[PDB]
Amino acid sequence: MEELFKKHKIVAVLRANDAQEAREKALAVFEGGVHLIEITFTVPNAAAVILLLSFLKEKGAIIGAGTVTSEEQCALAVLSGAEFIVSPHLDEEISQFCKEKGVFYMPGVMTPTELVKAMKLGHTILKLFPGEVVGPQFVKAMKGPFPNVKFVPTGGVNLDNVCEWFKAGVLAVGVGSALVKGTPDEVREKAKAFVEKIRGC
Amino acid sequence: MEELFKKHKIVAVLRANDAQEAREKALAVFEGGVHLIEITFTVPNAAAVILLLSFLKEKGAIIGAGTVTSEEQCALAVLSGAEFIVSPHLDEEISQFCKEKGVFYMPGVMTPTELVKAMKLGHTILKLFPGEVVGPQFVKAMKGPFPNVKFVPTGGVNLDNVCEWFKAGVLAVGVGSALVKGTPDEVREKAKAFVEKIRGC
Amino acid sequence: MEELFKKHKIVAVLRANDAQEAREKALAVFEGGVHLIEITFTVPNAAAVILLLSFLKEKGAIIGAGTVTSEEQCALAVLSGAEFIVSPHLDEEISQFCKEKGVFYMPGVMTPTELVKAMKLGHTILKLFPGEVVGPQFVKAMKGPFPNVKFVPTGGVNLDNVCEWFKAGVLAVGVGSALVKGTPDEVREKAKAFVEKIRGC
Amino acid sequence: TDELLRLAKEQAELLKEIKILVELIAMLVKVIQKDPSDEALKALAELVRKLKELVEDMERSMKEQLYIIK
Amino acid sequence: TDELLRLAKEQAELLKEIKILVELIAMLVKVIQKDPSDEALKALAELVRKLKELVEDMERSMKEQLYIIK
Amino acid sequence: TDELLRLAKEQAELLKEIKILVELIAMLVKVIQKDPSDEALKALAELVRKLKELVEDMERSMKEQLYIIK
Amino acid sequence: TDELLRLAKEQAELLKEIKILVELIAMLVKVIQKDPSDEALKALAELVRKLKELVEDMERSMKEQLYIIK
Amino acid sequence: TDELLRLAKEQAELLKEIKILVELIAMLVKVIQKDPSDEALKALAELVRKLKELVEDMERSMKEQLYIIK
Amino acid sequence: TDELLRLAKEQAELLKEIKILVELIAMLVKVIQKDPSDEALKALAELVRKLKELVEDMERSMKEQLYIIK
């Protein structure tokens, strides 16, 4: 919900070619200070990865499912034990059959028409994707007409431009290729770099 | 309407923290030479502000309502005497039910699909929001497939980049923070500067 | 038809103020080596041009219709002999009525929401319009969550930035004003230059 | 049976008008509480007069529908 | 039909209440015009809040009336 | 009454085809006016032949529907 | 229903008109092929225009007939 | 026949739950094939136990439907 | 109704098959927990694949039954 994003301020987006890389990198990301982790459903056997990370869930991590583009993928992800669902788009059925589940759903918008359609469905925290196409100026420009909406930008977030996103006023940032690429021990250092940089913006 | 935007070539979008500052700044903008003003429905008691600025209408001002995201807000704004309605998004029901009243509605688009939907709903003058995200490149690129559509850009219009927007071929520009912030006499000076610049280029 | 885009890798989007100029430039760009050509339905009497360009069809050209915003225009263009249909937007009715016709339809998207809506209708090759507003960063960002989608960017493709678009991983490029402006002998040289550079990098 | 739905639609129209006008009157009272003026009070008087006219119209329509249901 | 006439009864009661309240509001606005006061504006605000509640009651009763006719 | 309705469906299909083809013929005629050519005239003749065929199809369907309707 | 048979009669009239006009257009196209002329092309344009008008009339008649049947 | 449709709805609910759980079990089996582990087998046992419970619920609902349909 | 009860028979047969297969899968999982092996995991994979096929068959039959009862 609001407070986990507001407190941790960083979400790792896991892309992986297989499930063992995904599990090793989820562990390495959690060992750098990032307590919000997202397993995308482009990873093969991703609900299995979410199921077999409950020990981290007991240590303090929050695991969620990304790249959800179906109502059956949301059922599979909530069964496996995901605490939040994320989409790169907005879907009215994945949202109306998730409101009833009681699960946190964070859809993705790029234009203010999609923003208003998501607000009409009850969504106050939105995913800004792709964030490098629109930039922090989109977030600053949405302040006026839509003052209650919070954004989690995903796409093209680096160490150099992560302070600009928080100056613009985002809730958290979803970081991908700048965290989870490389060997599972380089990721452990990238996570620490990001976590300390975000606390010095 | 088409003729007023074509003639005056600048609309003052007005956001304020209370209603008295809104009325003061609307008066100052009208003194500066801007005859088209919009009161955003984000200013507290904005229909009251629209109602209490009727004295300017005899002087020659055109007053309208912005940030209208409901049909009840359109009703409330037409009651107090708004000449035109503006929206940061395209809403089909607002168009359906504002076409039956005969009120001028200017929706906001950002992509060609929203543009074609607005055209199918009957809209030839569109609002381009956020203008700073798409640039005058968007307006130049839309001339080919859609020659008849004219744009009013809103979002990051400055004294520097207004001549660019007018070379690209826009009817008018909606100027916000660059125009209406500061004390009510700096606002008058800014309005004078903007009118002089727009008539220069 | 995906094989033809993958083979020729360039589509000449042709806008003209006349039908004779359209036919002249279509022949001139076919002489330069461009086998894929599109006649925009903004050129006066465009179905007639598509019908009369069959002599080029027997030589190995592929002629199609662009800027289609209606189902009647799709019917007229398929009657006149068009091989493919293109739109700057996405329309569900045109798609579902062109699917039964067995004709190739390439809608245009700008946002991941429109992209997922087009994919749910079965479209795997999409047109990215306007390509100069989003850039090749949009394609690199879409790779991750949507690995099976190919883009044909249209808008602002020059000699300089075409290798950038191809490194980003586009299937083909649609070239307009950079290719078809000038006399019917400048167009031939421009087409030669484009084809040579595309096969170069 | 069709006059009945005609009067129901008439009443729904009138009630939407009345609710919008009450919203505007409330906003104008909040504005006057902070900056008092004579033009604001004249505008408030005009709004209250319109509200009285709307209430009378609603009351006529409701009595006609009550007669029809009788 | 008995449900329907009971709803008509409820609506007529609410409409008489609303008419009385609008009359009082008009009188208070005249009094404020001739002699301005702040407690008068607070009482006007209270009366407008009452009017909003009464309009809401009328509207949520008319939905039921229409649904039963529908 | 079902055969009648499918006959109406078929006639509507034919009518849309005829409307589209007449639009194409008008465009081609204007193009020929501006810059004449012989291949354009051959294409125009082919389109008119198609139009005659579609009109014959329409009439042989309308005779059946008039036979059934009585 | 005699409305429906009247609509069938009007459709038959329009279809005979369209058939005659298409035949004349075919003849004019052959004459233009054999010996081109510009006044012949202006007459062809006029014939195609009135053909468009007749097609529109047939369309607006068949819409009413389909309305009444379904 | 409505007490039949409420059961025909509860059964579709149960069947969708069963189809999701079977897909999860298949994925987990693939993951175990690639890299065998003990906690994975404990989780697989838990999932199979849940599947057995769901099948019993399905059969209870379908026997109730069979007793009503009789 | 014989359509309906034949579909009910189909569904009951399928449910017996599914329950037997789930019990065998549970037994094989326990055997793998005490002594793991690769042939055991390939047999488990094949059993889960057959279970998916059976669930799909059951789903079709149930949706056809629901279509008929509608």
Ligand code: NA
């Ligand atoms: Na769900």
Ligand code: NA
């Ligand atoms: Na309105």
Ligand code: NA
């Ligand atoms: Na078509």
